[PDB]
Design a protein around this nucleic acid. Structure first.
Ligand SMILES: [Ca+2]
Ligand SMILES: [Ca+2]
Ligand SMILES: [Mg+2]
Ligand SMILES: [Mg+2]
Ligand SMILES: [Mg+2]
Ligand SMILES: [Mg+2]
Ligand SMILES: [Mg+2]
Ligand SMILES: [Mg+2]
Ligand SMILES: [Mg+2]
Ligand SMILES: [Mg+2]
Ligand SMILES: [Mg+2]
Ligand SMILES: [Mg+2]
Ligand SMILES: [Mg+2]
Ligand SMILES: [Mg+2]
Ligand SMILES: [Mg+2]
Ligand SMILES: [Mg+2]
Ligand SMILES: [Mg+2]
Ligand SMILES: [Mg+2]
Ligand SMILES: [Mg+2]
Ligand SMILES: [Mg+2]
Ligand SMILES: [Mg+2]
Ligand SMILES: [Mg+2]
Ligand SMILES: [Mg+2]
Ligand SMILES: [Mg+2]
Ligand SMILES: [Mg+2]
Ligand SMILES: [Mg+2]
Ligand SMILES: [Mg+2]
Ligand SMILES: [Mg+2]
Ligand SMILES: [Mg+2]
Ligand SMILES: [Mg+2]
Ligand SMILES: [Mg+2]
Ligand SMILES: [Mg+2]
Ligand SMILES: [Mg+2]
Ligand SMILES: [Mg+2]
Ligand SMILES: [Mg+2]
Ligand SMILES: [Mg+2]
Ligand SMILES: [Mg+2]
Ligand SMILES: [Mg+2]
Ligand SMILES: [Mg+2]
Ligand SMILES: [Mg+2]
Ligand SMILES: [Mg+2]
Ligand SMILES: [Mg+2]
Ligand SMILES: [Mg+2]
Ligand SMILES: [Mg+2]
Ligand SMILES: [Mg+2]
Ligand SMILES: [Mg+2]
Ligand SMILES: [Mg+2]
Ligand SMILES: [Mg+2]
Ligand SMILES: [Mg+2]
Ligand SMILES: [Mg+2]
Ligand SMILES: [Mg+2]
Ligand SMILES: [Mg+2]
Ligand SMILES: [Mg+2]
Ligand SMILES: [Mg+2]
Ligand SMILES: [Mg+2]
Ligand SMILES: [Mg+2]
Ligand SMILES: [Mg+2]
Ligand SMILES: [Mg+2]
Ligand SMILES: [Mg+2]
Ligand SMILES: [Mg+2]
Ligand SMILES: [Mg+2]
Ligand SMILES: [Mg+2]
Ligand SMILES: [Mg+2]
Lengths: 57, 110, 129, 117
RNA sequence: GUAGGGGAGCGUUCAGUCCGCGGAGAAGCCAUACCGGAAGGAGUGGUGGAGCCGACUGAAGUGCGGAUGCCGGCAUGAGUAACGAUAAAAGAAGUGAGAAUCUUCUUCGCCGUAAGGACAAGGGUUCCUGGGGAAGGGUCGUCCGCCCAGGGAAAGUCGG
RNA sequence: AAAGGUGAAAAGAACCCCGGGAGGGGAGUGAAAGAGAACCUGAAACCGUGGACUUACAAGCAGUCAUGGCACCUUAUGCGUGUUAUGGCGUGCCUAUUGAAGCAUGAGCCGGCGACUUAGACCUGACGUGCGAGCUUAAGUUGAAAAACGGAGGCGGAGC
RNA sequence: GGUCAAGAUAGUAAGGGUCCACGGUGGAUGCCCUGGCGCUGGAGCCGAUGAAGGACGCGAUUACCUGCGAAAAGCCCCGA
């Protein structure tokens, strides 16, 4: 019992694990009603529109 | 660090004396002694002073305020004078009544 | 243009840091903050403000407050025009590290590393090109 | 008088480390693998120098019979026939003669063949 | 050419004497394609900001890769395992820079010879009020048994 | 247990800017803020950002030697420097051993600490100095910015 | 020149490596002294008149140290 790693990992080999840790940028879009900032199939957080006003802000 | 009293905790001058600076920016300039703290060898003389940016708030005021103010020197100034500059100093040799050990240089009393 | 020595140059010229601000000792792990900072890097400075309100990582908050400070210094102090600005450089480095013992099974402790970050951003005009 | 190690050890170590240029990994950065790699590298440098003498020997020869057989005789029945042509003895890097002037290496082929008759 | 014997030497600190150097910049550090048969030594540049080289002689706490060696720092495992009982939680409202986690309301589920209440040992301000938000809290935190300040503790008859 | 260092002097950073703050950017002071209170220097391991040359049919103790490619030009246009592709060759280090690449010990890495010394009128040799058929002092006394004196005693000189 | 065939050969880097440049971490190295170590030489007992060592207190404001003790960061006399 008790597996434990055998040699230390090289900086090269460990950094090439992390080859897949890249965050995906949000695909943002321009609110047609507010000024800008909006996430798709969601309300515009600033003005509250989702064709007219929804949420209070 | 023990400080100031390598000079045997003595001053080579008094609280109200006229004195001249030799040292740095203020060499050859003159002024009255105002504060003389002996155990830190500090001296304040008129016209040596500088711009203390002062307590950003609430010294009874909202805004801060620069203002010119006295900035003391180590006994790096050179002391009593009469024959009109510099001056070493020796005499301690009885005025009237014979008791006070007044001062002199190569000349008369201080 | 050429000075007499180095004491020379320290008097005549003062180093200054156009477009740069830094948050030191931010109490976060540098490799995390790096994931989100990498999302910023080289984007037009508006997008960077735009991307950071929707990235759902906790590090977005400290990273945005640095970016605004960089935008601010580029404008107030360095008198750049802000429709040219973009993030020329951004990068996070280690800080100190707080440590605690945390008890474990059978009696033994471990030391756990609460890591900080120096997050810095450097904006510049896109008048390169 | 105490006489701690200071400045001595860093200087030595830095000279070892600087021998490590594009050494891979911790070969370039940790002193101990840098120095150890250098022990084996000593072995290689000396052996190889001696061997490089013998390696260019080989390249020499391998060009010379390629030209020789281009003229219809092998190395063996050639460097023989120059030496059997005795005073002909130019020997050192005939390779280059075969590799650049063929008008000359053809004449040397004719000389060797005349000597073997 | 191993143990081993022999020879000539390089570098470090300290001491004596000499020759000197230093804010127009010293030691230390950093780069480097020069030099010597080696240990090594110089040149130039960058850094630093107050001491120091060379020669001759003397004395050593004088030369590290190892010792499951010591102290310290930092890595790998790795954004992994875990986040401490399978007694659930939901919505509205509020405060705030900021809220799944703080306050309120209304429901829901869990203990009920307990997971309710009163004492003794032991602890020592943890109590209440007003503030705070570094760290402590296994997340957060506007909250807390955390931090700051101010109060609170009453005996002829209870216990000694 | 660990323990240290602004600056000559606190002149210890008024005021403005982003931020709840923390943090920073300016303006000032100062010779220097390339000293700003996580305050002399600031190596190395470790973490990053940018650039050059490279790498997605490759078998590899990580080098070494050879040659082509591409950069570069401050001991430097060369018998250069950096980096590459490709060929040849190539079984970590120490210890312990008849025999170690060993699937035998030790070790994550770097920094610093870390092991043939001291003592004695002791023995026995090599080398060097003084005096030489003779050489020398010990305890101590007196003088000390310095050393002289002190024959008690010790070794040769006769052996069996 | 355009199709068709045969053949050869470049550039992409998700991420890596060597070098360089620039920083972060961290506290070696140099310099420094407020702190030690030793030898030499001085000096060498304290207490029932309360010792050595402590406890509690004394400040406008006092947590620590220092000094002191309800006369409590001190009171009287003498000399500098
Ligand atoms: Ca994951
Ligand atoms: Ca795993
Ligand atoms: Mg089993
Ligand atoms: Mg336990
Ligand atoms: Mg070889
Ligand atoms: Mg031949
Ligand atoms: Mg200089
Ligand atoms: Mg050198
Ligand atoms: Mg100085
Ligand atoms: Mg030793
Ligand atoms: Mg060894
Ligand atoms: Mg070791
Ligand atoms: Mg360790
Ligand atoms: Mg569990
Ligand atoms: Mg709720
Ligand atoms: Mg509100
Ligand atoms: Mg917050
Ligand atoms: Mg819950
Ligand atoms: Mg609650
Ligand atoms: Mg309500
Ligand atoms: Mg109960
Ligand atoms: Mg009690
Ligand atoms: Mg009580
Ligand atoms: Mg409470
Ligand atoms: Mg309350
Ligand atoms: Mg409260
Ligand atoms: Mg908090
Ligand atoms: Mg606090
Ligand atoms: Mg927390
Ligand atoms: Mg009653
Ligand atoms: Mg009773
Ligand atoms: Mg100081
Ligand atoms: Mg801050
Ligand atoms: Mg501030
Ligand atoms: Mg100025
Ligand atoms: Mg700075
Ligand atoms: Mg500095
Ligand atoms: Mg700070
Ligand atoms: Mg200094
Ligand atoms: Mg520093
Ligand atoms: Mg990068
Ligand atoms: Mg790179
Ligand atoms: Mg394939
Ligand atoms: Mg290929
Ligand atoms: Mg493979
Ligand atoms: Mg190769
Ligand atoms: Mg055996
Ligand atoms: Mg074998
Ligand atoms: Mg193995
Ligand atoms: Mg092994
Ligand atoms: Mg064994
Ligand atoms: Mg092992
Ligand atoms: Mg004797
Ligand atoms: Mg005896
Ligand atoms: Mg990439
Ligand atoms: Mg550090
Ligand atoms: Mg030094
Ligand atoms: Mg002392
Ligand atoms: Mg007492
Ligand atoms: Mg009091
Ligand atoms: Mg007390
Ligand atoms: Mg009384
Ligand atoms: Mg008196």
């Amino acid at each position: 019992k008790h597996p434990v790693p055998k040699k230390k990992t090289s900086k090269s080999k460990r950094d090439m694990r992390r080859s897949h840790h890249a965050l995906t940028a949000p695909n943002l879009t321009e609110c047609p009603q507010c000024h800008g900032k909006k996430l798709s199939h969601h309300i515009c957080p600033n003005c509250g529109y989702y064709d007219g006003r929804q949420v209070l802000a | 660090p023990s400080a100031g009293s390598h000079h045997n905790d003595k001053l080579h001058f008094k609280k109200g004396d006229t004195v001249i600076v030799l040292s740095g920016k203020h060499k050859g300039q003159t002024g009255k002694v105002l504060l003389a703290l002996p155990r830190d060898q500090k001296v304040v003389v008129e016209g040596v002073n500088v711009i203390t940016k002062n307590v950003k708030p609430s010294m009874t005021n909202p805004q801060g305020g620069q203002e010119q103010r006295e900035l003391a020197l180590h006994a790096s100034k050179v002391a009593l004078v009469d024959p009109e500059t510099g001056k070493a100093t020796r005499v301690r040799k009885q005025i009237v009544d014979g008791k006070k050990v007044r001062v002199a240089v190569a000349s008369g009393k201080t | 243009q050429t000075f007499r020595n180095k004491k020379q140059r320290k008097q005549q010229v003062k180093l200054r840091k156009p477009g740069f601000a830094v948050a030191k000792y931010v109490r976060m792990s540098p490799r995390k903050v790096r994931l989100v900072v990498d999302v910023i890097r080289g984007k037009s400075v508006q997008d960077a403000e735009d991307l950071l309100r929707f990235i759902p990582r906790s590090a977005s908050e400290p990273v945005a407050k640095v970016l605004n400070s960089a935008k601010a210094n580029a404008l107030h102090n360095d008198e750049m025009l802000e429709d040219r600005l973009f993030v020329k450089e951004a990068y996070v480095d280690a800080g100190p590290t707080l440590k605690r013992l945390i008890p474990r099974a059978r009696g033994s402790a471990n030391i756990i590393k609460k890591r900080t970050s120096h997050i810095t951003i450097i904006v510049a005009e896109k008048g390169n090109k | 008088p105490r006489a701690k190690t200071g400045i001595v050890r860093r200087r030595r170590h830095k000279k070892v480390l600087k021998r490590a240029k594009g050494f891979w990994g911790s070969r370039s950065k940790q002193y101990r693998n840098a120095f150890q790699t250098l022990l084996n590298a000593a072995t290689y440098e000396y052996r190889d120098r001696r061997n490089k003498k013998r390696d260019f020997r080989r390249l020499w020869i391998q060009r010379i019979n390629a030209g020789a057989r281009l003229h219809g005789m092998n190395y063996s029945t050639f460097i023989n026939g120059l030496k059997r042509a005795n005073i002909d003895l130019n020997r050192k890097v005939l390779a280059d003669i075969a590799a650049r002037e063929p008008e000359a290496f053809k004449a040397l082929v004719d000389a060797s063949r005349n000597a073997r008759q």
